[PDB]
Design a protein around this ligand. Sequence first.
Ligand SMILES: Cc1cccc(C(=O)N2CCC(C(N)=O)CC2)c1
Ligand SMILES: Cc1cccc(C(=O)N2CCC(C(N)=O)CC2)c1
Lengths: 263, 264
Amino acid sequence: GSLTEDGLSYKEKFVVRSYEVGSNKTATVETIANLLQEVGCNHAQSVGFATTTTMRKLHLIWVTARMHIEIYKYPAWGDVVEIETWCQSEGRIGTRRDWILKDSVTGEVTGRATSKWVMMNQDTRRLQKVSDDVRDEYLVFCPQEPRLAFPEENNRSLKKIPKLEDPAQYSMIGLKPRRADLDMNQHVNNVTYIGWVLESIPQEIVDTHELQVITLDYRRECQQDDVVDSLTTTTSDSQFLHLLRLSGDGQEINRGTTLWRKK
Amino acid sequence: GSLTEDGLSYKEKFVVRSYEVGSNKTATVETIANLLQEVGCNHAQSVGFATTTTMRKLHLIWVTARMHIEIYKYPAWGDVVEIETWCQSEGRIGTRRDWILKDSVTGEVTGRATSKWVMMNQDTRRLQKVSDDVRDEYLVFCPQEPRLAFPEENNRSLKKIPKLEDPAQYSMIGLKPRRADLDMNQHVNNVTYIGWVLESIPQEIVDTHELQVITLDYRRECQQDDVVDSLTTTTSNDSQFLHLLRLSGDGQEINRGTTLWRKK
Ligand SMILES: Cc1cccc(C(=O)N2CCC(C(N)=O)CC2)c1
Ligand SMILES: Cc1cccc(C(=O)N2CCC(C(N)=O)CC2)c1
């Protein structure tokens, strides 16, 4: 992997692995999400980091508020995919990281993703607007003019997501993380929540459809000893409304939507 | 990745990923096991496959009977590890696949692994001895003289493993696979069983010890709608454990194993 010529974006190539593919011999959406995370980490590392100097002193961290992924073609086992990533400041609200996925042989865009990140105190878990010192430190690594993976006006990445009402049409209950689901900081990996959301989609839909779009809002983390219920209702291609909540008290942890295309 | 000069083994390099590491910022044993599987798959593909022509005609497949891994140093996040793999015939019993893990910068051996594979009919699930036709078809891809990742006389990879007796000292109950745990053939990935075994090791042991050796026997697979219980009892600067995976309902054994840990 390497920063591009202008130093304002990062590219990396990946060979799709045998255990990274599903029953159609193409990468799953969780494999795609893991590769987006990996290229994001490699970009932060290449430019000196993604906590800045000022963030470390104030005990501030970036946390994902929303993830939006659109896949046109999933790469097959053995294929090489090239992923380009970059970040942009969104004023005092937070930051955005975008990605473009391309087939390395054809050079064609096979997917795109966007994510919204907010600043949070790592100990109290309280959100905070971005100060001048934090930006400026961050802004020299971002394009200054807007660069959007999802430019279109009224695109799917900015749609408001409603709360699923009981009863759910489908469900998968009692989902619990194992050690493989944790990151190096002993927090549940963001990609695990994508898997848990997908758990309540019926197998018949997975067997006959391909996931085209997923939008996920992150409200709260699955903490030590928490158990999750995954709920889904068809709203319609087939569209679904999703809700992840704690098994016990019903506290919301995520809400999302998926759009599927018949194979 | 590429076959070596003589065409009898295969090597591949991997850069350890951010999500592949644990709290120590080094690859987990499940990441190592996934990389062993990936390099094995790439070796079978490079030589024309790992079902041979005669196996596909008779609906026969290779299945893992045992996996044995020893790690001296886990590679750190961003490090490059080089893995060499090869297969050997073990007469009519089955086949063996071995691996050697090396630090790409120093060239030093940081781990080794060995696995025993048996032939089985895909449909009935019945095991069977290796015939001459099958044996001849894969012998041209194997070294003829013995080549062992674990050569030593009384090595840990060939130890008999006893069955854990109730009550277990530790347990993790109701473990169930999600779609990410399945392979392209809709079977639970062999590496998931390694994770499930490790689930019943207490967090305090994980925090203060490093896993040095794991030996796992595969007896039966976790099938559609099956739920697993993971049981562990200490048998022992080192700590040894006895492990048992069994179905939550009837208590049917799916795996048994042992782990050896050393204090950090
Ligand atoms: C640190 C953390 C953060 C969030 C959730 C968990 C948790 O509830 N686990 C994962 C690991 C655990 C184990 N010891 O196997 C079983 C359940 C742990
Ligand atoms: C095909 C197979 C083989 C072995 C076990 C399972 C199983 O029990 N699952 C995994 C996926 C499933 C789902 N539909 O989310 C929930 C439980 C499925």
